[PDB]
Design a protein around this ligand. Sequence first.
Ligand SMILES: NCCCN[C@H]1CC[C@H](N)CC1
Ligand SMILES: NCCCN[C@H]1CC[C@H](N)CC1
Lengths: 271, 271
Amino acid sequence: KKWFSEFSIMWPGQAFSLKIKKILYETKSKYQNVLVFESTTYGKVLVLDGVIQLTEKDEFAYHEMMTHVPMTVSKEPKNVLVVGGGDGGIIRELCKYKSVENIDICEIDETVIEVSKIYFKNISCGYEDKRVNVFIEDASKFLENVTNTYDVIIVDSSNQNFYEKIYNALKPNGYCVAQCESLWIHVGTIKNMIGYAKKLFKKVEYANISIPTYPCGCIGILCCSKTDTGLTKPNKKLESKEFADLKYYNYENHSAAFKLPAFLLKEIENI
Amino acid sequence: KKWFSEFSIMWPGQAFSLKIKKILYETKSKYQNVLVFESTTYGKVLVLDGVIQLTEKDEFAYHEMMTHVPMTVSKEPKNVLVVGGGDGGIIRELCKYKSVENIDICEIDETVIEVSKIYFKNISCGYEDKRVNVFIEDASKFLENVTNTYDVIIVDSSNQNFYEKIYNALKPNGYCVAQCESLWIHVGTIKNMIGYAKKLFKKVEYANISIPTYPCGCIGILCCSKTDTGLTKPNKKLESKEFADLKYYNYENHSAAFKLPAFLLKEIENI
Ligand SMILES: NCCCN[C@H]1CC[C@H](N)CC1
Ligand SMILES: NCCCN[C@H]1CC[C@H](N)CC1
């Protein structure tokens, strides 16, 4: 059998590879190359421009932490925006909250959504929920155009003007979490991201998620708060039957994810 | 340039690769194949039987956590044993403690030690400390033969009889920490290891370390206590000048490393 290998100038000198049991789908969309394959040991894999987007075996780690960190801090979130995230994993976690009344997702490439609906049914199931509204659209145009404000915005996608638009689209006590780089390779980028956020948000925090199929085995969450209390401590426990199946997130893990290695703390305490 | 690739039946279906700037040394010892190369982005790399043992860029994560977790819990450790660990990283962290009077290291393959002394000077520097005594010897024979008991034993190497020997070689309030698998691939093995330890030790805990060049980007520490308080909370802060250069470990990270993902907690609460 052949092997998929993940190369990139963003992590030069290293690569991760998965063994292919069988290729399922391949296309070039208007925006990116799309590959779906069944791996031998990580279940199905989604690849965009040769970079792994998710695998069945571990996606719960990233989707649970990205969603339940902000959603357990926000008191009674009613309206939530997902930027990027065509695969639907965040939306699947969001639908577990009965308080939520509306979920907007903005994804520029509908092929991602369609491929996820077809090949990743246990990840894209949230799309069948009546609260979920899909916008095939560039996120800057969406954010500039939306009239509603959001309690939580979750940026599930790899700019200082952009974070102004996020801030304006948030309620007064709203929160934004954004995917934000591995601490093992792009500390310079993390510093820039915290710098951009701190000009607008009064509380900017960084958490780490362990996930083996992202480069270096982990990925950060940039956490932006308009209030002074920040996002490190949940205000609620996920006890109802909808959360009985959670596989990574729990009340203790939430806080622990913000306890960073000493070298990173040193780089970012002076920003 | 060529690429080193790390394959193994222990993690089937996946592989990690580093780009080679230049090969430095290669031999077959009595016990294993030994490769040393300068990578393009992780500095120098030590490989044993085709499995990465360490790299300069990230070794501090594993050596700091393996050492300072037990050494900040033990009140006044005087005698410490390192099993395996020919590369010297643990010993380098141990020498920072002025209270320590003796450090025994037991390593079956002296080539490892010699290669580390030659090619990894910032990792093997502890060998020049007068407290350090080297035994080229199988660890089961060493543990069966030693007359001293230890305050801390650090098993830096990839068996129920073996943990009996560890228990007997420890002081009444002594501690053992052992390298113990990635939670992303060998949960069955972690369960067995905790099972073996719990028959002898009254407190058996599991912590996670983020380190990108180990498979799945992380590696566990099996933590065994003879006292009931366990190893999750340090009894001291590392404030003296010897610890000013620490790059991963800190007082908060210590406890956070024991906050495990929900699926692992579920597998190991019933053992
Ligand atoms: N298409 C891959 C997932 C991320 N999608 C986002 C869609 C909206 C864009 N403004 C940014 C990427
Ligand atoms: N040689 C590689 C590092 C681990 N070395 C250990 C030496 C002692 C043995 N009983 C187990 C492996």
